């Protein structure tokens, strides 16, 4: 232990502490390759002239005939497949997934927030039916094919506002942990004449590209509101969008592994062609919560709040008839706010009672 | 010339839009002081 105190008094830092610089060695390492890359054109393959010559159009630029790399999947070089081009030799470098619309991207990257099936409240039979009709084709298609049925394309979830259709679909996505397209119909109608149907096409093309994907088209009454020949331009464009949706949904190109959810508050105004099976095989009445459903809503939403002594769901249920979901949650929210009026760190029965009273009064 | 990028004598680059041509983030020539350059004034620049 003469010069072996811990390790020569130097190696403890000469081995790792200064060797942190080697991590920077790794850093600059990427940089070297990050400087030998030259970037590449991006274009779309227009045609397969022969086994080697590919007619390729660069975006916002000229078009060429270009060969592909020696090792590449020519079978996947279908027309329209976005590809990269070496800027100098102009050869097919690597295919790219189809360009996604910024709107579709934005609608595609909102986090579902891992909402659990516990957090629904009193939807047991309907949630089981929806779980069946959506998820079961995503688990045992062999079951259906041995039965002999074609897996369902999708279903409608109709009910009054605040009945939890959006949250129910979000929970379905979170349980699935698949690609979710939370789309609200009122946000896709545009003054630009051919843009709404184009957006629908982009949505469904994204869905086909990113199986398994879930298309949740909220407020579908704003698109599929029956076809009539009054002739005003706006509703006519709405019919065009509706029929683009109908084609993208049960059109010539058959759909595989893509299931759709359409929620509305006025199911009766939907187009009969959209209402027909093959497109919307199930119509699920997500209706107002019953008394049992109401108390389930209160008990499930009562989780995060801290209860002091006694809180009974039944009295609130009796005093909150006609409530539907979110409003009940409202009762909790301002209750905590009520807790700051007299400066508590908790909630009381009177707190909840006056909270539900205020919620009911605001509902009038 | 566009936003000054908050130079403070260490980041004197500015992004400039050459008309219908592109826009580039560039630095000054030695002959001009930053006090003479500010957002939104027409500036004559070299080509490479």
């Amino acid at each position: 232990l003469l010069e072996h105190k811990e390790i020569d008094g130097r190696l403890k830092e000469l081995r790792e502490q200064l060797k942190e610089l080697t991590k920077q060695y790794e850093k600059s390492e990427n940089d070297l390759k990050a400087l030998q890359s030259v970037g590449q054109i991006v274009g779309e393959v227009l045609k397969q002239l022969t086994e080697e010559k590919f007619i390729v159009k660069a975006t916002n630029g000229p078009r060429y005939v270009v060969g592909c790399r020696r090792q590449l999947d020519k079978s996947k070089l279908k027309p329209g497949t976005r590809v990269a081009l070496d800027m100098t030799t102009l050869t097919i470098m690597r295919y790219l997934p189809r360009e996604v619309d910024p709107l579709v991207y934005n609608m595609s990257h909102e986090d579902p927030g891992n909402v659990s099936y516990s957090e629904i409240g009193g939807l047991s039979e309907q949630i089981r039916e929806l779980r069946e009709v959506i998820e079961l084709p995503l688990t045992n298609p062999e079951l259906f094919q041995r039965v002999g049925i074609i897996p369902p394309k999708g279903c409608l979830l109709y009910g009054p506002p605040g009945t939890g259709k959006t949250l129910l679909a979000r929970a379905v996505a979170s349980q699935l942990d698949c690609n979710f397209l939370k789309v609200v119909s009122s946000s896709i109608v545009d003054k630009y004449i051919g843009e709404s149907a184009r957006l629908i096409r982009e949505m469904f093309n994204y869905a086909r590209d990113h199986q398994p994907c879930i298309i949740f088209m909220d407020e579908i009454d704003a698109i599929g509101g029956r076809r009539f020949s009054e002739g005003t331009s706006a509703d006519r464009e709405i019919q065009r969008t509706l029929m683009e949706l109908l084609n993208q949904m049960d059109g010539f190109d058959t759909l595989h592994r893509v299931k759709m959810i359409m929620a509305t508050n006025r199911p009766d105004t939907l187009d009969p062609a959209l209402l027909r099976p093959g497109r919307l095989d199930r119509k699920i009445h997500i209706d107002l919560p019953n008394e049992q459903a109401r108390l389930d809503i209160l008990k499930i939403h009562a989780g995060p709040i801290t209860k002091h002594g006694e809180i009974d769901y039944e009295a609130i249920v009796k005093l909150s008839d006609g409530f539907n979901g979110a409003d009940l949650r409202n009762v909790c929210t301002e209750a905590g706010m009520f807790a700051i009026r007299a400066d508590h760190d908790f909630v009381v029965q009177e707190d909840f009672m006056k909270a539900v009273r205020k919620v009911a009064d605001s509902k009038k | 010339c566009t936003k000054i990028i908050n130079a403070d004598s260490e980041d004197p680059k500015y992004i400039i839009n050459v008309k219908q041509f592109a826009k580039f983030v560039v630095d000054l020539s030695d002959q001009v002081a930053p006090t003479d350059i500010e957002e939104g004034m027409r500036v004559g620049v070299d080509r490479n």
Partner: protein, 106 residues
């Protein structure tokens, strides 16, 4: 001790060489990351361990197998960047320009 002191001397000499190696790397990285970057809107980021596609202000889309010399997490699809004018990699990130009407209100 003796073989361990030999290991200590070995590691300190390799550090001594690698310091100037890092200096040379920084020298050449400044040699190539010069200054007149070209602005470009990052169209999006794809997976291959990530690649990018951008749209330069010379109305040209451009695929980058490696996203230049910056981080690769925030990189919003619309994040204006300064990309090298010849080898076309994202040399730096620069603050967003505006959102039209958001500039209209001061």
């Amino acid at each position: 001790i003796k073989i361990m002191k030999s290991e200590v001397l070995r590691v300190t000499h390799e550090l001594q060489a690698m310091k100037d190696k890092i200096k040379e790397n920084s020298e050449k990285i400044k040699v190539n990351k010069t200054l007149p970057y070209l602005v470009s809107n990052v169209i999006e980021l794809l997976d291959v361990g990530k690649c990018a596609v951008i749209k330069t202000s010379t109305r040209q889309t451009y695929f980058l197998p490696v996203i230049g010399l910056v981080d690769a997490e925030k990189l919003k699809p619309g994040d204006l960047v300064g990309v090298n004018k010849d080898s076309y990699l994202i040399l730096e990130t620069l603050p967003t320009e505006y959102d039209s009407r958001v500039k209209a209100m001061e």
